[PDB]
Design a protein around this ligand. Structure first.
Ligand SMILES: NC(=O)c1ccc[n+]([C@@H]2O[C@H](COP(=O)([O-])OP(=O)(O)OC[C@H]3O[C@@H](n4cnc5c(N)ncnc54)[C@H](O)[C@@H]3O)[C@@H](O)[C@H]2O)c1
Ligand SMILES: NC(=O)c1ccc[n+]([C@@H]2O[C@H](COP(=O)([O-])OP(=O)(O)OC[C@H]3O[C@@H](n4cnc5c(N)ncnc54)[C@H](O)[C@@H]3O)[C@@H](O)[C@H]2O)c1
Ligand SMILES: [Fe+3]
Lengths: 869, 419, 200
């Protein structure tokens, strides 16, 4: 039963550990009942413990401890009784979160002599609500009391449905014993108290800790204060337990304006101002051996002077010494737990808090500070006192001894002894301790599918003869200044009068910018914003496709936000809503209506805008749904006179826009029927549009509509990896986009079409690799294989249809065959296989390629081979 | 000429709602109104969005006073509230009756001068409209959540309401009152009853079956209609029987119903929604149940290569309806190789009966709680007033009042529509 | 029961109401004590109903849309001169009320607030009381009559007999200590319009 040896300890802990494991399986009602019985047993025993605390400690006063043994039970209960601390605290079912709050284990309670019983009723009683255990290592001066404070708690818990040794205490303490308890393995936490050396040794143990320092507690009394209650509260805080209590106001800092008044008001109401010889004698007994006399602590005032060598009335509550030094040389400013007090003299407020912060900074860093002022009309002072004072508790118009243990003067403050002083003091709690610190929360995280979107430009218009019907719809009914962006071949050949012809004839002012060439550079973009910033357009228009529709919707940026650094605008990301350079909201200065005369790109719907740096020459595909065209237009009358090449490269980038959008990882049921309806039109009408041309406008139109439909697909289901390398392959060699996508898709499919790949994209919605299947759902949709095929022929037949399609469009079989030299390829292939993996298009490819696996399907194309793996 | 216009945002996955308000509402607005029905105010569905707004600097107000087949009395009631709270955003919720009522309150809030009769005016085209609707993005935006899987009102301009005086649902329409955002999360329909997952998920079958065949049908609004049809075939039965026990199906169907809205918002409905609206406001039959009884005949109606009339649309040169209804089956698998374009429809209609039998759908209107005396007496009314609905100005054979009644009756007596 | 509360509602409205007007939120204690007083008076007049000032006020503040408190501040300084007549025309016929004591109660009020000097005669304690109101109505922005309160002499005299007969028909007046005559109400309506007194 008794504990004065190191083995008795190692036995106790075990018969305790085994209580917890039996106590942890308890419910809320089975412990809500243990919590009361232990709190009553502690309240009804408020007087005796307070007697047993003075007989043994030699300090304190009875009637002021009784407010503590009682506060530590009633004011603890009213607060932590309804705190759900057993199981599920919260359950957000929209998400998949649940907080379950298992306990922590067992604890070591390091008790002081200052508050031996309250600090025990407080910990004992709070460690039962969290379904924990605890073991006390008390102070020799108060071992009999704080251990009689737990038996009065335990013997009332076991009587309420608890085990019989859940709690434990050391009877004959030491260092060899505590240091053997704090370092015990079956312990799981340390709940300490007692100032420096204590917390310096709690954390240093090896276990966690909620140790708690302590020290000075400056209090400031400004001109705009109620010097009456400022003083009573100063005395009601020192004399309370004779200041032995922590946080008590060891030092006031008054401003000259009201010092004399305060000086007297302290005198009449039991204040002896240490004027001369008395003072020195008093600041000589305080500090013994660099520390405060351990015999003066908690003792009444008149009992101070006797040790000093003088005498004062027995009714004196306090001993005040008017001083100026605010450093360590003055022992009259350290953490004297006596009723003594230091009275400083300051010019104004700012001169005080500068002085307070200086003497909290010496012994009481982080604990608490106080202020007395107009709590309602001087909120800036407050704001200036909280932002300047490095204390975890700033107590405005409250006494510290009864506001730091806070449920009396202020609510919303966690009632507690064991007041955290923040890392400033050497403890990482920063708050009044409670049961939510003795607790191991834990979070079950159900798989949540990542949110998706089908976002387009409103006002898509599509048929032959749709320009004037559209401009005169939403543009002219509205804006007044336009900026048509296009290329020369369209400005020269009357593709841009067909649009000004309509704006003119109404009130509008046009200005065309036609210095855009294939693969636009950032130099052309600036030059376009440099113009937009002069013409100040109310709207922006973009013709052709790709180069214009990619230079314009970015010129739309530099016009509304010229501070945009392309280096940050083209930063590769991992998710498009968790973007690190969130695009600015740009639809205010001007809109970005878009027209297209080129089939494939589909840029008229999608956020993508491919441009190159003009310094490194790397195409930086940059993406955000803020640069959607805002009323795209797609008229098939601007395509019927296209050459045979641009038709192929276009309609053949659209194929690889849907192919790697039906198979992508962001694919959905919204973007999977459009991709197919595109891929089914590019099969019935694409060859015709190449051979026949304008002679079959029915086909030249569908292809134009399809290539846009893919946009609806790959605007939401981003591209795959064929573009991540086609952008680099089409830059280091100036190969066109569509021609590059054609030389890879018949080797990229068979890359992604492995159900046992080396990697995978880590997308929640992506259960497992479906690409091999997601590619056969294509063939069966086109009509390649009806009868019961292996799912591997449906692919061979998909490729075959491509090699057949790439044949009847003049597409070469390889790059070598496309105007590239093995000497210039092998050299800068490792460079653009890395710069491909670092593209934003590849973050959606189902297989998450390895640099060592793009290089291979990048050589196998130069030599017209097949990636076999 | 044609178009394909929708909101500039359609967020859709289980758990998207907070991730559709934590994103956009609070980034732009601080005064929100919510429109719904009592079942959702009560059952804690509207405090799934007020939770996340109030947590921000937003002030909410909920107009929970909506009823099935909404009236113009409620609409004017919510405007008074909207005129008092002065919202920066409107958030419709509940599906259909609320959504169809909030986007019209949006009107009476932006422009209280309006007169409902000038909105319910049928027309020959949407551009060549006499009452050009006003611009509505200036006072408050309009969000649209949904809790049913059969309407598509999240995307479409259709806003069906009732005068409360004549009792005539006026399926008015204009893209100016499309929502700015549409949120379709299955978190809200997992616990939906069977009487709704059937009617709702079975109108959607029409939203898409008289949209892939309509004259305004385009390549844009044909793959979506189909994808809304290949999902309502593999997941609608399961979402009825298994219910929440197959949330993937109860989710895919929820997206399909919306995808069909991506279709019939661009390619208007045909004739089943004209006779439905009038046949479901008189006899107070629900929407989806009026569409499931007729669709299996309207097909037999529109699938006549030699009808009396076409709808006179340039893009529609020859009647192709008998063909489109075949590509449907050819896409769903009902079709066997070596057919003749006449059985693919039988194999299609066969898939519906098979689908209407396994959802609790009757075989006629008589079985649906309508007395032969209350029908034949007012059939010529809803047969002349269907012709006067805006939805029928898009179906491919411009029905005759001679020919509508005949299919009303053949759906009462469970008969077919031979000709 | 309802006499110490009424008074405590009156010793606080005298030491803290002026300060809560001028200083406003800069003296929240007064802006607080006054808030409690107003309620303590509710602890009184909930049990001991109002008199006649709230009858004429309600009718005089619904016709001319004058606020409640402003209709009560213009009249109270006369109703006192009315109820403080030891020999009125009528009493309110209440058993607990044997003799008219109103001229006396209004003195214990002053005697409690300090307005009274030792050696008075029960006739000045009321003057010293009314003097405290004017002094209090002048320092809150309260006018000296109804005319100054935005009411045209033509719109008043034309409908005075209405609100003078309809005040008598209010429930509040069935508790004041001298059962006013319609002859006597109008006279104090008008003397509050022309800022005059209510001699008799
Ligand atoms: N912030 C609070 O909650 C609070 C409350 C009351 C008192 N206090 C502070 O407590 C202190 C009271 O003085 P005390 O009574 O703590 O005297 P003290 O500071 O000597 O406390 C010594 C305690 O340390 C324990 N201990 C265990 N292992 C130790 C080790 N390795 N090295 C040193 N000590 C070890 C001893 O058992 C003993 O109880 C003051 O600083 C007072 O401000 C803080
Ligand atoms: N954002 C997207 O949606 C997306 C996706 C993939 C690729 N891209 C980018 O799109 C760009 C492709 O641009 P494009 O290839 O679409 O055209 P392009 O911009 O290369 O220029 C095509 C050239 O063909 C000629 N031309 C254009 N329209 C014509 C017409 N109607 N009749 C006759 N000649 C005509 C002009 O000389 C024009 O410069 C590449 O930079 C590619 O990376 C964009
Ligand atoms: Fe492309």
């Amino acid at each position: 039963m008794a504990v004065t040896n190191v083995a008795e300890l190692n036995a106790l802990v075990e018969r305790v550990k085994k209580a917890q494991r039996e106590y942890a399986s308890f419910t809320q009602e089975q412990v809500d009942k243990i919590f009361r019985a232990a709190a009553l047993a502690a309240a009804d025993a408020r007087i005796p413990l307070a007697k047993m605390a003075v007989a043994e400690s030699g300090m304190g006063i009875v009637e002021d401890k009784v407010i503590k043994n009682h506060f530590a039970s009633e004011y603890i209960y009213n607060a932590y009784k309804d705190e759900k601390t057993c199981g599920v605290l919260s359950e957000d079912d929209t998400f998949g979160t649940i907080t379950i709050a298992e306990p922590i284990g067992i604890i070591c309670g390091i008790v002081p002599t200052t508050n031996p019983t309250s600090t025990a009723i407080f910990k004992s009683l709070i460690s039962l609500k969290t379904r924990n255990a605890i073991i006390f290592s008390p102070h020799p001066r108060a071992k009999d009391a704080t251990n009689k404070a737990a038996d009065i708690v335990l013997q009332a818990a076991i009587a309420a449905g608890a085990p019989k040794d859940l709690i434990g205490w050391i009877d004959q303490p030491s260092v060899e014993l505590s240091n053997a308890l704090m370092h015990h393995p079956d312990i799981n936490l340390i709940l300490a108290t007692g100032g420096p050396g204590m917390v310096k040794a709690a954390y240093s143990s090896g276990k966690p800790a909620i140790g708690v320092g302590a020290g000075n507690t400056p209090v400031v009394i400004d001109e705009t204060a109620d010097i009456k209650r400022a003083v009573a509260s100063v005395l009601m805080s020192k004399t309370f337990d004779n200041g032995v209590i922590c946080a008590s106001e060891q030092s006031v800092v008054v401003v000259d304006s009201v010092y004399d008044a305060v000086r007297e008001r302290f005198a009449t109401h039991g204040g002896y101002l240490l004027q001369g010889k008395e003072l020195k004698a008093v600041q000589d007994v305080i500090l013994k051996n660099g520390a405060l006399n351990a015999a003066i602590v908690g003792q009444p005032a008149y009992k101070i002077a006797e040790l000093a060598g003088f005498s004062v009335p027995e009714n004196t509550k306090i001993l005040i010494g008017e001083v100026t030094v605010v450093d360590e040389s003055e022992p009259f400013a350290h953490e004297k737990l006596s009723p003594t007090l230091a009275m400083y003299r300051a010019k104004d407020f700012e001169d005080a808090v500068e002085k307070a912060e200086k003497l909290v900074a010496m012994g009481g860093i982080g604990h608490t500070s106080c202020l007395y002022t107009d709590q309602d009309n001087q909120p800036a002072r407050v704001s200036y006192f909280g932002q300047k004072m490095k204390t975890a508790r700033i107590l405005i118009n409250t006494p510290a001894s009864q506001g730091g243990i806070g449920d009396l003067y202020n609510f919303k403050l966690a009632p507690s002894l064991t007041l955290g002083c923040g890392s400033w003091g050497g403890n990482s709690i920063s708050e009044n301790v409670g049961p939510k610190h003795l607790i191991n929360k834990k979070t079950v995280a159900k798989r949540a599918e990542n949110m998706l979107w089908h976002k387009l430009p409103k006002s898509i218009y599509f048929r032959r003869g749709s320009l004037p019907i559209a401009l005169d719809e939403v543009i002219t009914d509205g804006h007044k200044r336009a900026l048509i962006v296009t290329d020369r071949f369209l400005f020269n050949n009357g593709y841009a009068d067909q649009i000004t012809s309509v704006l003119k004839a109404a009130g509008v002012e046009t200005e065309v910018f036609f210095e855009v060439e294939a693969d636009p550079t950032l130099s052309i973009v600036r030059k376009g914003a440099e113009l937009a910033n002069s013409f100040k357009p109310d709207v922006i228009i973009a013709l052709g496709g790709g180069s214009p529709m990619d230079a314009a919707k970015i010129m739309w940026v530099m016009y509304e936000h010229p501070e945009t650094h392309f280096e940050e605008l083209a930063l590769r990301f991992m998710d498009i809503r968790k973007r690190i350079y969130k695009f600015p909201k740009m639809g205010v200065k001007a809109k970005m209506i878009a027209v297209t005369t080129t089939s494939g790109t589909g840029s008229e719907v999608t956020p993508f805008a491919v441009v190159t740096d003009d310094a490194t020459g790397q195409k930086y595909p940059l993406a955000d749904y803020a640069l959607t065209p805002d009323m795209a237009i797609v008229d098939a009358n601007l395509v019927m006179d296209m050459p045979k090449s641009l038709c192929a490269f276009g309609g053949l980038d659209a194929v690889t826009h849907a192919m790697e959008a039906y198979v992508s990882v962001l694919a959905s049921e919204f973007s999977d029927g459009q991709a197919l309806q595109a891929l089914k039109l590019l099969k019935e009408y694409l060859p015709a549009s190449y051979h026949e041309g304008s002679k079959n406008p029915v086909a030249r139109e569908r292809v134009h509509s399809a290539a846009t439909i893919a946009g609806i697909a790959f605007a939401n289901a981003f591209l795959g990896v064929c573009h991540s390398m086609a952008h680099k392959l089409g830059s280091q060699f100036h190969i066109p986009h569509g021609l590059a996508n054609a030389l890879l898709i018949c080797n990229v499919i068979r890359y992604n079409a492995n159900d046992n790949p080396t990697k995978q994209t880590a997308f929640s919605q992506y259960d497992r690799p479906q690409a091999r299947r997601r590619y056969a759902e294509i063939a069966d949709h086109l009509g390649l294989s009806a009868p019961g095929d292996r799912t591997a022929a449906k692919i061979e037949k998909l490729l075959a249809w491509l090699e057949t399609l790439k044949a009847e469009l003049g597409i070469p079989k390889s790059i070598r065959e496309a105007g590239v030299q093995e000497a210039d390829f092998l050299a800068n292939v490792d460079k653009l296989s890395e710069d491909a993996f670092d593209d934003q298009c590849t973050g959606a490819n189902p297989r998450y390629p390895l640099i060592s696996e793009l290089k291979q399907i990048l050589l196998d194309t130069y030599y017209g081979r097949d990636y076999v793996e």
